[PDB]
């Protein structure tokens, strides 16, 4: 240790005018005791099998050398505090050095973790390591398929379970897709089965077939082992067909189930704009297609509603800028559906869903950039769509923020 730190300590104690040989005598004695303890604290690190040298190793190394692990305070009577340590304090250099005494009481205590349990698994089966989640990772000859019989038994069973005849079968197959480590090298056949399926499954609008395939896409995405952006190109079209294309079945009823699938599709669309991102290829391409779907005139109100759902779930900055200028076209479309008597078509249902989603999204956008003053009739400057009900939604958001 440096001697110019030892003279600062001495003159801040009342011992002034110390010589350099007196001061060098202090810094070779205490630097030995640090070296004697750190060599002795490495014994507790090597028998604790942790190669870490935690803060408690010096507490036992001090107690071994008959020195109290007491730090920052030394009791000359020893009777109140013996060789038991006080685990020091939580330290940071960047601390505040003054807290309020009711701030420490009102904070929630951390969760005591689970107790130690003994689980057994298999490192090796007769020499081979299994791929379980407890483990880390002139005629030309007649060729063999690159899948094993069993690798494809998995496939045929997983695909026949993922078409959702039974719900428990689906859910396991979806978890199996979500965490099989060896599901690479089968992934072309899964991507082709998804893509091909949606395209011949929108010829007749079979909603379950589509809701099961979208859940299969979601189960493919959250698997951490497999490399997906080689099959990224098929991802944008397959989800988009369910969310914005017309429904060949019944638009008015099954639309609620269609909407659960719609939410799944917007979540996958956000994943596409969250993962797999490079410069100006994926997110901007789907944003441009969504906007020219919106600026589209007399679009299938199913498509229009789907395009609105796609443009709505894109995040914080997207929605505010995109909706701002449109504050009139949406209202005019709603007014046309209202005036024309035609009720047996799906136009009225599409209009109500679009207006509710646009209004609900507007409330955070308004709650996010501006105070909640004049929430009664100022929204009549924005054609009076949501008005006081929009203000009530903003108030509910403020209450949720207060709860947080």
């Amino acid at each position: 240790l440096p001697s110019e730190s030892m003279k600062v300590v001495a003159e801040s104690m009342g011992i002034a005018q110390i010589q350099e040989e007196t001061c060098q005598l202090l810094t070779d004695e205490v630097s030995y005791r640090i070296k004697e303890i750190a060599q002795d604290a490495l014994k507790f690190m090597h028998m604790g099998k942790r190669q870490k040298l935690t803060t408690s190793d010096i507490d036992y190394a001090l107690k071994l050398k008959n020195v109290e692990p007491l730090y920052g305070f030394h009791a000359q009577e020893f009777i109140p505090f013996r060789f038991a340590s006080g685990g020091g304090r939580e330290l940071y250099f960047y601390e505040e050095k003054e807290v309020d005494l009711s701030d420490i009481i009102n904070t929630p205590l951390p969760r005591v973790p689970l107790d130690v349990c003994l689980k057994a698994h298999w490192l090796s089966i007769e020499g081979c390591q299994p791929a379980i989640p407890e483990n880390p990772p002139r005629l030309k000859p007649r060729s063999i398929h690159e899948l094993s019989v069993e690798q494809q038994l998995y496939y045929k069973e997983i695909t026949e379970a993922c078409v959702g005849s039974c719900e428990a079968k689906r859910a396991e197959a979806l978890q199996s897709i979500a965490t099989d480590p060896g599901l690479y090298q089968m992934l072309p056949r899964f991507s082709t089965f998804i893509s091909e399926g949606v395209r011949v499954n929108v010829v007749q609008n079979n909603l379950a077939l589509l809701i099961y395939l979208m859940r299969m896409v979601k189960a493919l995405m959250d698997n951490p082992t497999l490399y997906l952006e080689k099959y990224v190109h098929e991802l944008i079209p397959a989800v988009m067909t369910c969310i914005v294309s017309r429904q060949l079945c019944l638009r008015p009823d099954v639309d609620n189930h269609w909407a659960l699938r719609d939410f799944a599709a917007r979540l996958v669309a956000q994943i596409c704009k969250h993962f797999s991102t490079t410069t100006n290829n994926i997110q901007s391409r789907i944003t441009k297609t969504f906007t020219k779907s919106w600026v589209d005139e007399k679009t299938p109100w199913t498509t229009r509603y789907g395009s609105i759902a796609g443009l709505a779930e894109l995040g914080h900055d997207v929605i505010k800028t995109l909706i701002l200028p449109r504050l009139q076209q949406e209202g005019e479309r709603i007014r046309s559906v209202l005036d024309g008597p035609v009720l047996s078509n799906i136009d009225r249902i599409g209009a109500d869903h679009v207006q509710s989603l646009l209004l609900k999204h507007c409330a955070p956008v308004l709650a996010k950039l501006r105070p909640p003053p004049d929430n009664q009739d100022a929204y009549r400057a924005e054609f009076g769509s949501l008005g006081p009900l929009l203000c009530s939604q903003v108030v509910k958001a403020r209450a949720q923020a207060a709860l947080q």
Partner: peptide, 25 residues
Amino acid sequence: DLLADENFLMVTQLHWEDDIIWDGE
């Protein structure tokens, strides 16, 4: 950097916007 493998993956180079079927007729 324009020779990076991703540039050549066909998600970043293709018309999958047409593959989206609106009103299958």
